[PDB]
Write a protein that binds this DNA or RNA. Structure first.
Length: 1357
DNA sequence: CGTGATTCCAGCGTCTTGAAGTCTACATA
DNA sequence: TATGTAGACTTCATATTATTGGAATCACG
RNA sequence: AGAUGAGACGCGUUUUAGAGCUAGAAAUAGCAAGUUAAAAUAAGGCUAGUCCGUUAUCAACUUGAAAAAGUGGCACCGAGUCGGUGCUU
């Protein structure tokens, strides 16, 4: 019944929880232990951690589910195609389909003849010889007009439909005119007919090879132009070739036109633009451009497939046949050459399936790239292989028909081939003629994005609403599914709700309102300085409107030069202007406005606000519904305002992505007194010009209050729903839920009381190239030659001193002293703002100088004399991006305003307030779960204060007072960090009452910079209630205060509250108490048990083998003939005490053994456990003794050895290592784990401490041994570690600890893992036997681990 | 003849966009 | 006519790793 | 730098078919051939659909078919995974 506080630290893999009283001790409690063991009470501390498997995302589940749906859909499509052929096939061959369906079974289990296609070996051999592959059959069917057997037609159709190719390309691309060279000849003929006086000789030019080569468009155009000595690329023929290749040529020069004749086939408007062009050029040239477009289509076809013969009626089959012929010829040549020149490598390449040779490439698992890499050196070594080497460079050597690059084949090719086959063979089979439309519909059927899966109220993923209850087929899909209702449901379901307003719809990424908001947001912080203006002024409403209209509505991108010239010079008549806040091209732009102006060609319509809503409905309509038909259907309602060309142009364009804000948050909510929305505020703000971040965080505006009101009550009362809907990764949400459960358990344990303070902080969860680019840009801007004199790479630039030296161009930021490399060790990095005023330690805050005394006087900011010295030097670095704007202003803070009260207030808020918002939601959950009562004023009684603090304060506290953390020694660091969280939070709230307004939730009123800030000097006694003149937060804990020049100040031995007089910190006992708490050997580490769910087993389908470990992939197909999956993931083990038949006599012998239940059999076991256990071979099962052991069950054996049952057959280390604080401090100091920043005298003292306590290293190697012999029992690894340590006893202490930190994985918690001591690698130790835990003590531990239930398994059986 | 130590392995790619580099008609001396 | 010169426009990328439990393999007292 | 969600594509993997031949009596040796196709692609279930099955959740005991609810004093001295003492019961 004593007042106490709870400290919680939340992490992705950990939840640390500690309990503190008001004396900063740690309470210890007696707990009863249930079960049949002798122990009936155990004393445990209230500080510990909870560990669990990291939360797994749902991406894998989504991918697997989609794959399964696609496979079922494809199988049903094949079934429909078989249905169409059912009658005719039964007329021709009554058992063909049954033979096709059962081909996978071996001869023993087959019901018909083993040969599928024809049922006799002779006809099968004839078919295979007459057609090597199905592509030969398809081409033969297409070209020939003779009647073919029904089975061949069925096989061709099935292979066409089962693999229909992608549907990315929309429209039509196969006009049956795709011969590149032939179309080029036709274009030349048309050009010669139109221009008889200027003919072009194209004879001898291999246009087909040039255009179809794997080269860029410009390169191919140049190559083709080079083949015509008398033609240039800017000529009419060159422009036509560029258009065919897909470039953007201008025909204005060729015909001396006034309008810029820019024609591109990608743009839809070309359809009109060409015709309008013809208006000036006449109708004679139309055929020329039609031939050019046909040639372009031929080139596009040639991009994806290669063909030479002109007799092709099927562009795909001919290409595959050509590739097959090339493969055959190259294989024969390669075999001959290998047998001739290098007979020693014949067997390896052509017989060994293990190797990456041809045998492994065809029969084994060798991929194409592996085979190319293996055969390239052999081909290079041999002679006469120039053809093969060229093919290998072109990646077309010994290829197959099924390759990874077939994923670009559009369905048009297969559709055309199927249409050709049906046209050829319908004259001999009437049903094909009658059902041609059905087959084409089956092949082209694509379930549209909006429609979604075709469920009937049994699936939680589908939202399709049908017009009638009937089976859905591709032939009648147009009428069964109601398009409009499904589209509306898709709109209302798919869109992601706004984070700020959970009940509002987010805007489209390219919506007009969102783009306006983005433009205005950055527009309100732009400033301009001219000659006549004394001080820069903010853009007024008239200026912003003029800039938007003249620039944002006329130029796609607005640059700094454009802003300065087109507006300030043209309108404001300013010759020189200095733009502040924005540099270079603006990030925001009105792209959608320009796109709509291009389409509708009505600027006034876009400028009309009344039509805006309609425009919005357009943007969303183009944001989603990729399918064209629905775009047309929905835009039909607005088709009355636009022409058919405009409607088609709107249909063609499609947008992507989404925005970040809702529509109401931009223009829906209005302030109480002003009566203006956010966009209205940005339009006319006047003096303030507050941005969106300031507008939503302005305490003087109702916007923040409305945001707070809308945020709460986001969903129902259920905790699970609130956890689920939190914006974050699954791991962090699991951590939050576990944290809530842990704090509820703690509330329960402490006698149904309620904590007075709860502290929660959440751990935060490439650069070298960026820093190198920044350095290069700065050097190029300055022109210095320091890089040539001192070259460096990214590996050596780890130390911040070198980075500062490069950023300073080998100079000093305080004096005009040239930097010396040999003096870099003597140099001391100093913070621009002293550590007393602010603990920033950032790179921009760091400055490298010869002597810190040169920084200036005791004033925090460096002296303004240094500013007068190096104003230009600093501004050059600022303009060269070497330094940041914040760093430049901090260097010049003394000149500008010294140390204004605003700087102090900002420092305090930055040190205190939490930037992220997830912590606020966690605090809201905790407050609603603790505060449940109201006062007389109907206001929530805030008994529990949920204070939140950043991790930086706790890290600084750890580093200040020799409280060092090592993230590899053990897992107590989570609990210790939670304990320090609680201590710091309680101390800070007690010391500073008013600042609690920022800590505790929004119920407390806000304050201002007036209080707690002294105008000048360190006023003694704090009479005016000013808490800290210095801008620190936690500096009162230490016994001294440093200054900028090096001056020192002292603090009282005991710190007490300023007003109430309560003691807040007893420096004579509090540090000793914290040391004792951190030195406690007993900390509660419990692993959260998780019954394993997931894949039934590894998905790699292993070949057949003579073992029982294989699991059948189907009910009938036993694994002894067809192989199957292996290594199932055991969901949870089951301890059964029963008897099993033994020997030929089947004698029942009592056995106690662990049985693993797979995920596949889990449902069967959980339905009828007794029947399943009997089926596996257990007789007379003790139902009451069946004990469920999930993964991570805890076992204790003699001498405190702990194990975790990771599965049915592998155990994990279950013990933690409790090290004294002195050894941890020695390990952290000696290893230089973090940066060595600090006072040089302090660094020297730490180095002396490291040197004087070297022998501790040996002690550590002792303790692990004494630990290992009672915990790990891995003698070989321990001996190898001892030998390696003895070998490296002479290594320097700088690197004699970086290896010992990695050495602790030997006796760590979790799964065993291999490590490396210097160059000697110690492999992981495996526990292949779990028989011992059958005679150990099982420990059922509560979620926080305070309660126990010990079961002595030895007392069974 | 388990038994303990050692070795190898696990289903995976794409569905557009933006900065980079460059060629160009045009302004100015 | 020679040299910038903004500008329009094609081009080359536009994410990496990882545990840890199963099974196989093999020396071995 | 926040998660969930709809539609396709390309493969990969496993069995079978594409009679391997010659000299041996087999074991073996030599020679020819390599591309493709059918089925499956988590066991399967009922709700029988172009549905659903790898996300979230899950200590023990008692009640409740489930959703959920309820279960065990405290103080002090120390510290090798907690022990001892006092008090209460």
């Amino acid at each position: 019944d004593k007042k106490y506080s709870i400290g919680l630290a939340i992490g992705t893999n950990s939840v640390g929880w500690a309990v503190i009283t008001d004396e900063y001790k740690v309470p210890s409690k007696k707990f009863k232990v249930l079960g049949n063991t002798d122990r009936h009470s155990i004393k445990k501390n209230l500080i510990g951690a909870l560990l669990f498997d990291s939360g797994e995302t749902a991406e894998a589940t989504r991918l697997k589910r989609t794959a399964r749906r696609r496979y079922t859909r494809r199988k049903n499509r094949i079934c429909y195609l078989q249905e169409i052929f059912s009658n005719e096939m039964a007329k021709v061959d009554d058992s063909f389909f049954h033979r096709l369906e059962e081909s996978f079974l071996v001869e023993e289990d087959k019901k018909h003849e083993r040969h599928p296609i024809f049922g006799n070996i002779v006809d099968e051999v004839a078919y295979h010889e007459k057609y090597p592959t199905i592509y030969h059959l398809r081409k033969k069917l297409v070209d020939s007009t003779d009647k073919a057997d029904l089975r061949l037609i069925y096989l061709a159709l099935a292979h066409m439909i089962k693999f229909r190719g992608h549907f990315l390309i929309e429209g039509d691309l196969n006009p049956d005119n795709s011969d590149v060279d032939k179309l080029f000849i036709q274009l030349v003929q048309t050009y010669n007919q139109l221009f008889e006086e200027n003919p072009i000789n194209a004879s001898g030019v291999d246009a087909k090879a040039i255009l179809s080569a794997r080269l860029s468009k410009s390169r191919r155009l140049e190559n083709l132009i080079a083949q015509l000595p008398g033609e240039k690329k800017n000529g009419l023929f060159g422009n036509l070739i560029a258009l065919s290749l897909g470039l953007t040529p201008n025909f204005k020069s060729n015909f001396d036109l006034a309008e810029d004749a820019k024609l591109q086939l990608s743009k839809d408007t070309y359809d009109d633009d060409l015709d309008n062009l013809l208006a000036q050029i006449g109708d004679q040239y139309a055929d020329l451009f039609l031939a050019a477009k046909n040639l372009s289509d031929a080139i596009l076809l040639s991009d994806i497939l290669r063909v030479n013969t002109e007799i092709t009626k099927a562009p795909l089959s001919a290409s595959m046949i050509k590739r097959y012929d090339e493969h055959h010829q190259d294989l024969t040549l390669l075999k001959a050459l290998v047998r001739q020149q290098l007979p020693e490598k014949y067997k390896e390449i052509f017989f060994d399936q293990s190797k990456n040779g041809y045998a492994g490439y065809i029969d084994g698992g060798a991929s194409q790239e592996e085979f190319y890499k293996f055969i390239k050196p052999i081909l290079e070594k041999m002679d006469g292989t120039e053809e093969l080497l060229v093919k290998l460079n072109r990646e077309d050597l010994l290829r197959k028909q099924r390759t990874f690059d077939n994923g670009s084949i559009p369905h048009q090719i297969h559709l055309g081939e199927l249409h050709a086959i049906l046209r050829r063979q319908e004259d001999f089979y009437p049903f094909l003629k009658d059902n041609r439309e059905k087959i084409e519909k089956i092949l082209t059927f694509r379930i549209p994005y909006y429609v979604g899966p075709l469920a009937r109220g049994n699936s939680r993923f589908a939202w399709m609403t049908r017009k009638s209850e009937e089976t859905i087929t591709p032939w009648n899909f147009e009428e069964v599914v109601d398009k409009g209702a499904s589209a509306q449901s898709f709109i209302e379901r798919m869109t992601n709700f706004d984070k700020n307003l959970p009940n509002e719809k987010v805007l489209p990424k390219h919506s007009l309102l969102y783009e306006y908001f983005t433009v205005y947001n950055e527009l309100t912080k732009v400033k301009y300085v001219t000659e006549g203006m004394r001080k820069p002024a903010f853009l007024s409403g008239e200026q912003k409107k003029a800039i938007v209209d003249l620039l944002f509505k006329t130029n796609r991108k607005v640059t700094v030069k454009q802003l300065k010239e087109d507006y300030f010079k043209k309108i404001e008549c300013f010759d020189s202007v200095e733009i502040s806040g924005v540099e270079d091209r603006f990030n925001a732009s009105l792209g959608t406005y320009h796109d709509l102006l291009k389409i509708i060609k009505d600027k006034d319509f876009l400028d009309n606000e009344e039509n805006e809503d309609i425009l919005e409905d357009i943007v969303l309509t183009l944001t989603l519904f990729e399918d064209r038909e629905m775009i047309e259907e929905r835009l039909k309602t607005y088709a009355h305002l636009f022409d058919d060309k405009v409607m088609k142009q709107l249909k063609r364009r499609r947008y992507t992505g989404w925005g970040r804000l809702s529509r109401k948050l931009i223009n829906g909510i209005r302030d109480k007194q002003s009566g203006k929305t956010i966009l209205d505020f940005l339009k006319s703000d006047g003096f303030a010009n507050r941005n969106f971040m300031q507008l939503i965080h302005d305490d003087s505006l109702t916007f923040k209050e409305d945001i707070q009101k809308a945020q709460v009550s986001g969903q129902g009362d259920s905790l699970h729903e609130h956890i689920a809907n939190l914006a974050g990764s699954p791991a962090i949400k699991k951590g939050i839920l576990q944290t809530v459960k842990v704090v509820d358990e703690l509330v329960k344990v402490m006698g149904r009381h309620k904590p007075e303070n709860i502290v929660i902080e959440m751990a935060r969860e490439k650069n070298s190239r960026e820093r190198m680019k920044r350095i290069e840009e700065g050097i190029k801007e300055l022109g210095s030659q320091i890089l040539k004199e001192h070259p460096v790479e990214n590996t050596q630039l780890q130390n911040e001193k070198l980075y500062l030296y490069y950023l300073q161009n080998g100079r000093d930021m305080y004096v005009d002293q040239e930097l010396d490399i040999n003096r870099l060790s003597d140099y001391d990095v100093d913070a621009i703002v002293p550590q007393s005023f602010l603990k920033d330690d950032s790179i921009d805050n760091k400055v490298l100088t010869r002597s810190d005394k040169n920084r200036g006087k005791s004033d925090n900011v460096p002296s303004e004399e240094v500013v007068k010295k190096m104003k230009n030097y600093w501004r050059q670095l600022l303009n060269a991006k070497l330094i940041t704007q914040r760093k430049f202003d901090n260097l010049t803070k003394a000149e500008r305003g010294g140390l204004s009260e605003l700087d102090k207030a900002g420092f305090i808020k930055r040190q205190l307030v939490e930037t992220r918002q997830i912590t606020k939601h966690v605090a809201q959950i905790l407050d609603s779960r603790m505060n449940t009562k109201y006062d007389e004023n109907d206001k929530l009684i805030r008994e529990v204060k949920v204070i939140t603090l950043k991790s930086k304060l706790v890290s600084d506290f750890r580093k200040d007072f020799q409280f060092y953390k090592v993230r590899e020694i053990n897992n107590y660091h989570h609990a210790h960090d939670a304990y320090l969280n609680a201590v710091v939070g309680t101390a800070l709230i007690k010391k500073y009452p008013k600042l609690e307004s920022e800590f505790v939730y929004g119920d407390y009123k806000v304050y201002d910079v007036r209080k707690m800030i002294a105008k000048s000097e360190q006023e003694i006694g704090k009479a005016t209630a000013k808490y800290f003149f210095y801008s620190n937060i936690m500096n009162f804990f230490k016994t001294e205060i440093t200054l900028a020049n090096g001056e020192i100040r002292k603090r009282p031995l005991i710190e007490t509250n300023g007003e109430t007089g309560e003691i807040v910190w007893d420096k004579g006992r509090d540090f000793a108490t914290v040391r004792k708490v951190l030195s406690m050997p007993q900390v509660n580490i419990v692993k959260k048990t998780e019954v394993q769910t997931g894949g039934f087993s590894k998905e790699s389908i292993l070949p057949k083998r003579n073992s029982d470990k294989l699991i059948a992939r189907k009910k009938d197909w036993d694994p002894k003939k067809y192989g199957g999956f292996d290594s199932p993931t055991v969901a949870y083990s089951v301890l059964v005490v029963a008897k099993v038949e033994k020997g030929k006599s089947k004698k029942l012998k009592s056995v106690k053994e662990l049985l693993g239940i797979t995920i596949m059999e889990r449902s069967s076991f959980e339905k009828n456990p007794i029947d399943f256990l009997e089926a596996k071979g257990y007789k007379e099962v003790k139902k009451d003794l069946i004990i469920k052991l999930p993964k991570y069950s805890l076992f204790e054996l003699e001498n405190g050895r702990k194990r975790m049952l990771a599965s049915a057959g592998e155990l994990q280390k279950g013990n933690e290592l409790a090290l004294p604080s002195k050894y941890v401090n020695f390990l952290y100091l000696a290893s230089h784990y973090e940066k060595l920043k600090g006072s040089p005298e302090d660094n020297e003292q730490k180095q002396l401490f490291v040197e004087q306590h070297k022998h501790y290293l040996d002690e550590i190697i002792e303790q692990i041994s004494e630990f290992s012999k009672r915990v790990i029992l891995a003698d070989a690894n321990l001996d190898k570690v001892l030998s390696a340590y003895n070998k490296h006893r002479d290594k320097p202490i700088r690197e004699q600890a970086e290896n010992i930190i990695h050495l602790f994985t030997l006796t760590n918690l979790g799964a065993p893992a291999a490590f490396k001591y210097f160059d000697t690698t110690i492999d992981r130790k495996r526990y292949t036997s779990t028989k011992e835990v059958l005679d150990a003590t099982l420990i059922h531990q509560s979620i926080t681990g305070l309660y126990e239930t010990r079961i002595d398994l030895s007392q069974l059986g």
